[PDB]
Structure 1
């Protein structure tokens, strides 16, 4: 990987692996999400970072509040996928990380993603506004003019998500993370939540349709010893409403929507 000529974005090529593909011999949305997370970490490494000289002195961390991914063509096993990522301040609210996925051979855009990040004290777990020091050190690595992966005014990534009303049409109960689901800080990987949302989608849908759009809100983090229940109801192409909650008290951890197109 490498930063572009202007230093305001980062590019990396990936060869799709045999264990990264699904039943259609193409990469899964979780493999795609892992790659967006990989190019995001390599972009932060190349510019001297989530950890900053001001966030580290205050014990502040960036936490995902929302993820939106739109895939037009999933790369096949052995294909090369080029990803371009960049950051942007959004005033005091937080930061946004956007991605463009391209087919390395044709140059065609095959996907796009956007994510919203909020500040939080790592010890207290309390949300915060972005102060003037972290904002100043971020604007040196970000384009000053707005650069949006989803430019459309009032697009799908900015739409509110309702709460699934019981009873759910479909469900997957007793979902638990294992060590491969944790990251280097022993926290559940944000990609694992995507897979848990999708566990309650019927296999008949997965076999006849392809995932086109997914929007995921992150409300609470699941601890390594927590148990999750994934719920799904058809709202309609096929559209679904999703809800992740703790198996016991019913505490909400995530909510989302998925759009699927017939193969």
Structure 2
């Protein structure tokens, strides 16, 4: 991997592994989400920010401030097959004092064609109080010299899916998977549940017949609260719709506290 010529974006190639693929012998969306996080982390390293997933400056570290994901939105046109080489380009942009955005473009390395795209919204939070805060000029200025100054969007479209508000699923859910719990493999280096595990949990309540006959085209996921030590999660799904659409809700199995909400769009194979 390397920063590009102008130093405002980062590119890295990956060869799809045997254990990274599903029943069609192509990469799962969780494998894609993991590669997006990996290239994001290598971009942060390439310019001197923290490499713990929080991409902080020394200024944020003394204030105990971190960046956290508020939303992930992925659209895949073609999942890469096992053994295929995928090239991913990523870049970041400030969105005033609200937060930051990281975008990605996925390409087939052999054809050069765009096979997927993704975008994410990040907010600044105190790591101890968990209180959100607006971005100060000092923090914004530190990041601005590492971002394009003119807008560069993976999702330029007028009223695109990545910015739509997601409603709260109402009981009874059509489908559910109960009592989901993380194991050590689901944790990151900071002992926090990896953001990709929540994508897996959302997908667990999609019936197997949909997965066997359809391909996931778009997923939008809001992150509202973390799954903490000893927490157990229920995954709820209701059909909202050759295309099938679903509304998703992850909540704590006991008191029903919301942890995530999302939507998925699937195309018939």
Give TM-score, length-normalised by structure 2.
0.97
Please, which runs of 5 or more residues in structure 1 have no aligned partner?
none
Distance 1:169 1:224 in 2: 29
Q: Which of 158, 163, 173 is the equivalent residue of 1:158?
A: 163
SS, match of residue 215 in structure 1: strand
Asked whether the 8 Å contact 1:169–1:234 carries over to 2, the reply is: yes
SS, match of residue 173 in structure 2: coil
- Aligned structure 1 segments of 4 or more residues deviating by more than 3 angstroms: none
Distance 1:35 1:134 in 2: 27
Asked whether the 8 Å contact 1:10–1:86 carries over to 2, the reply is: yes
Distance 1:68 1:116 in 2: 9
CA displacement at 1:68 relative to structure 2: 0.1
Distance 1:200 1:170 in 2: 6
Asked whether the 8 Å contact 1:182–1:224 carries over to 2, the reply is: no
SS, match of residue 133 in structure 1: helix
Q: Which of 94, 113, 117 is the equivalent residue of 2:122?
A: 117
Distance 1:202 1:234 in 2: 11
SS, match of residue 33 in structure 1: helix
Distance 2:54 2:249 in 1: 33
Matched residues, number: 263
CA displacement at 1:22 relative to structure 2: 0.1
Asked whether the 8 Å contact 1:100–1:111 carries over to 2, the reply is: yes
Change (3 A) 1:174 1:74: same
Instruction: Kindly provide the CA deviation profile for residues 93-149 of structure 1, in whole angstroms up to 9, marking residues without a partner as x.
Output: 000000000000000000000000000000110000000111001000000000000
CA displacement at 1:49 relative to structure 2: 8.7
Distance 1:134 1:49 in 2: 14
Asked whether the 8 Å contact 2:54–2:68 carries over to 1, the reply is: no
Asked whether the 8 Å contact 1:157–1:215 carries over to 2, the reply is: yes
Asked whether the 8 Å contact 1:177–1:224 carries over to 2, the reply is: no
Instruction: Kindly provide the CA deviation profile for residues 23-74 of structure 1, in whole angstroms up to 9, marking residues without a partner as x.
Output: 0000000000000000000000000991202111100000100000000000
Instruction: Kindly provide the CA deviation profile for residues 181-211 of structure 1, in whole angstroms up to 9, marking residues without a partner as x.
Output: 0000000000000000000000000000000
Asked whether the 8 Å contact 2:54–2:67 carries over to 1, the reply is: no
CA displacement at 1:153 relative to structure 2: 2.0
Instruction: Kindly provide the CA deviation profile for residues 201-243 of structure 1, in whole angstroms up to 9, marking residues without a partner as x.
Output: 0000000000000000000000131000000000000000000
Residue 256 of structure 2 corresponds to 250
Distance 2:225 2:159 in 1: 26
Change (3 A) 1:226 1:184: same
Change (3 A) 1:250 1:156: same
Distance 1:34 1:242 in 2: 21
SS, match of residue 38 in structure 1: helix
Asked whether the 8 Å contact 1:178–1:224 carries over to 2, the reply is: no
> What is the RMSD computed on CA atoms of the aligned residues?
1.0
Distance 1:116 1:51 in 2: 16
Asked whether the 8 Å contact 2:246–2:264 carries over to 1, the reply is: yes
Give TM-score, length-normalised by structure 1.
0.99
Asked whether the 8 Å contact 1:188–1:224 carries over to 2, the reply is: no
Asked whether the 8 Å contact 1:163–1:255 carries over to 2, the reply is: yes
Distance 1:224 1:126 in 2: 19
